[PDB]
């Protein structure tokens, strides 16, 4: 039941999503090993992801979490990179989309930094890079990220020196880098129904000049 609607580059909505992408690129401590070497993206397309059933699944869970957290959904827009983006937009998030060995427990991970999510587009650690060239820093092949609506509820704050259940009385974990002060937060949910894949962004990383 999913349909994808192209946004025009002249639309404020497109422009706002692009600015969130570009403005949250940072340097990574791997020197680009996983996601490649770049300071900015070439945005090729931004689509709205429309699925009535997945939307209702999301809003029903958001309502439950909101009431449990004293009428506060604590809803965010966050990036998600994955080799299973095509499955996610059609079937929704579920246990198959978790990062079992993630530092804040076995759940589904999201980032404030677009460039953090870019590290997972070709798998954990960037896998072997793009299919065609086996290049984690490929400037040719098209990549996709999701920009998702995520319900955090009561979030457990975990400072970090950079499917499971949530901490008791918590609906998510907030992983907050405490050493690199330019690194933004990462977030973990333990129920697929707490995220909706609202935008599908197609892009290339750009070689610095």
Q: What is the largest CA-CA distance in the chain?
A: 51
Nearer to a second copy, 34 or 148 (CB): 34
Report which secondary-structure segment, H or E, holds 86.
helix 85-91
By CB under 5 A, residue 85 contacts Zn ion: no
Nearer to a second copy, 124 or 206 (CB): 124
CB 59 → ligand KC8: shortest distance, Å?
Answer: 23
* Separation CA 50–CA 47 (nearest Å): 9
The counts of H helices and E strands in the chain are: 4, 9
Three-state secondary-structure class, residue 74? coil
Footprint (CB under 6 A) of ligand KC8, residues 89-118: 97, 99-100, 102, 109-111, 116-117
Q: What is the CB neighbour count within 10 angstroms for residue 9?
A: 11
By CB under 8 A, residue 5 contacts a second copy: yes
Find residue 195's DSSP bridge partners: 150
* Separation CA 69–CA 199 (nearest Å): 27
Select the binding partner of residue 138 from a second copy, ligand KC8, Zn ion, none (C-beta < 5 to 8 A, by kind). Zn ion
By CB under 8 A, residue 165 contacts a second copy: no
Annotate each residue in 127-156 with x if it binds a second copy (CB under 8 A) or - if it does not, as one string.
----xx-------xxx-x------------
Rounded to 5 degrees, what are φ and ψ at 189? -115, 155
Of 22, 12, 10, 1, which is closest to residue 201 (Cα–Cα)? 22
By CB under 5 A, residue 161 contacts Zn ion: no
The number of residues that bind ligand KC8 (CB under 6 A) is: 19
Footprint (CB under 6 A) of ligand KC8, residues 38-97: 79-84, 97
CB 133 → Zn ion: shortest distance, Å?
Answer: 4
By CB under 5 A, residue 132 contacts Zn ion: yes
The answer to whether the beta carbons of residues 143 and 36 sit under 8 Å apart is: no
Under the rule (CB under 6 A), what is the footprint of ligand KC8?
Answer: 79-84, 97, 99-100, 102, 109-111, 116-117, 120, 123-124, 186
């Amino acid at each position: 039941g999913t349909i994808l609607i192209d946004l025009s580059p002249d639309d404020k909505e497109f422009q706002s999503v692009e600015e969130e992408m570009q403005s949250t690129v940072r340097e990574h401590r791997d020197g680009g090993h996983a996601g490649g070497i770049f300071n900015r993206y070439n945005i090729l397309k931004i689509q709205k992801v429309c699925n009535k059933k997945l939307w209702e699944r999301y809003t029903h869970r958001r309502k439950e979490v909101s009431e449990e957290n004293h009428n506060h959904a604590n809803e965010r827009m966050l990036f998600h990179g994955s080799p299973f983006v095509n499955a996610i937009i059609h079937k929704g998030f579920d246990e198959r989309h978790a990062y079992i060995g993630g530092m804040f427990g076995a759940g589904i991970y999201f980032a404030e930094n677009s460039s953090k999510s870019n590290q997972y587009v070709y798998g954990i650690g960037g896998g072997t890079g793009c299919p065609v060239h086996k290049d984690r820093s490929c400037y040719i092949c098209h990549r996709q990220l999701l920009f998702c609506r995520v319900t955090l509820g009561k979030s457990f704050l975990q400072f970090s020196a950079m499917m499971a259940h949530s901490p008791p009385g918590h609906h998510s974990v907030t992983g907050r880098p405490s050493v690199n002060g330019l690194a933004l937060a990462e977030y973990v949910i333990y129920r697929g129904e707490q995220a909706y894949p609202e935008y599908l962004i197609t892009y290339q990383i750009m070689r610095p000049e």
